[PDB]
Amino acid sequence: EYPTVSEIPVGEVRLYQIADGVWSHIATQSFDGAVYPSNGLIVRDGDELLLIDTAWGAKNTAALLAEIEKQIGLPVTRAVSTHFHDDRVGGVDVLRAAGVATYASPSTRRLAEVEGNEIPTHSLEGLSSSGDAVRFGPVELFYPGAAHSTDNLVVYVPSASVLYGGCAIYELSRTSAGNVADADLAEWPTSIERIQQHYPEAQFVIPGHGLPGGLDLLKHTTNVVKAHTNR
Ligand SMILES: NCc1ccc(C(=O)N[C@H]2Cc3cccc(C(=O)O)c3O[B-]2(O)O)cc1
Ligand SMILES: [Zn+2]
Ligand SMILES: [Zn+2]
Ligand SMILES: [Zn+2]
């Protein structure tokens, strides 16, 4: 029942309710002639919503906000971007213009600037060392160490045992490396181990791209990254 890449035209956004007050958002984007799905998260915080990640571009993110207003009808007041690439910050200007306060770690803000990408306004403190965690409204933000990118964060929703891994976690159908130009292959398995150690109770694990599963997605990702290391 989870929407798949073949079911979502580029420019449209789907919402998937995971638990009371917890949804993923799913969009698609063209990249080198192929179409990829991408996931983010929406978490209810009282009568407001917290958004995790844009929907990969300004047009998709505008559609995301329209879809949230239509289907949920509560204001998105804050958003967190889990790393500096365009599937996570692309659309931050649309969010900002809509009154959403945008956040990212200082590491992400710096890398986005260097890269010429959109830059979340607010800096999240307390995430600069591997293994650091902070509570941000209804979620916990965790810096596991460098993996898909040096700045990547993961997000946990304690009320629903939902772990959103972002692009540091691969879906099961992905059996070879994705986009790894900015990755730290040497540290990626260690960073995943920090995730497993901190969130052993996670029930629903969401990759940056594709289908959710359980905690098996962590060991899956390690296997793929190690095989790519040994290419
Ligand atoms: N300057 C080189 C460069 C250009 C684009 C991207 C980029 O936007 N990458 C995103 C889109 C994408 C495209 C294909 C696979 C993935 C993935 O997460 O593996 C994926 O997620 B990224 O965050 O790395 C990264 C580096
Ligand atoms: Zn990335
Ligand atoms: Zn502000
Ligand atoms: Zn990605």
Residue numbers in the entry: 32 to 262
The authors write:
The β-lactamase-catalysed hydrolysis of β-lactam antibiotics (BLAs) is of central importance in antibiotic resistance. β-Lactam-based inhibitors (for example clavulanic acid) of the Class A serine-β-lactamases (SBLs) are widely used in combination with penicillins. We demonstrate through biochemical, biophysical and cellular evidence that cyclic boronates are potent inhibitors of both SBLs and MBLs. The cyclic boronates act as ‘transition state analogues' for both ‘serine' and ‘metallo' enzymes and therefore represent a promising strategy for combating antibiotic resistance. The combined results reveal that cyclic boronates act as dual action inhibitors of SBLs and MBLs by mimicking a common high-energy tetrahedral intermediate; they also reveal that cyclic boronates can potently inhibit some PBPs via the same mechanism.
We obtained high-resolution structures for VIM-2 and BcII in complex with 2 to 1.5 Å and 1.9 Å resolution, respectively. In both these structures, the electron density for the inhibitor clearly defines the geometry of the boron as tetrahedral (sp3). The mode of binding of 2 observed here, in which both boron-bound oxygen atoms participate in bidentate coordination of the Zn1 ion, most closely resembles that predicted for the tetrahedral oxyanion formed during β-lactam hydrolysis, with the implication that these inhibitors act as mimics of this state. First, one oxygen atom of the inhibitor C-3 carboxylate coordinates to Zn2; the other carboxylate oxygen interacts with Lys224 (NDM-1 and BcII) or Arg228 (VIM-2) by hydrogen-bonding/electrostatic interactions. Second, both the BcII and VIM-2 structures reveal that in the MBL-active sites the bicyclic phenyl-boronate ring of 2 is very similarly positioned to the cephalosporin dihydrothiazine ring (or analogous penicillin/carbapenem derived rings), with both being positioned to make hydrophobic interactions with the conserved Trp87 and Phe61 residues. Notably, the ‘endocyclic' boronate ester oxygen of 2 coordinates to Zn2, mimicking the coordination of the cephalosporin-derived dihydrothiazine ring nitrogen in the anionic intermediate. Third, the binding mode of the side chain of 2 is analogous to that of the 7β side chain of cephalosporins, in that the carbonyl oxygen of the 7β-acetamido group of the side chain of 2 and the cephalosporin intermediate are both positioned to hydrogen bond with the main chain NH group of residue-119 (Ala (BcII), Asp (VIM-2) or Glu (NDM-1)). The pro-(S) boron-bound exocyclic oxygen coordinates with Zn1 and is positioned to hydrogen bond with Asn233 and the NH of the acetamido side chain. The pro-(R) boron-bound exocyclic oxygen bridges Zn1 and Asp120, mimicking the proposed position of the hydroxide-derived oxygen in the oxyanion intermediate.
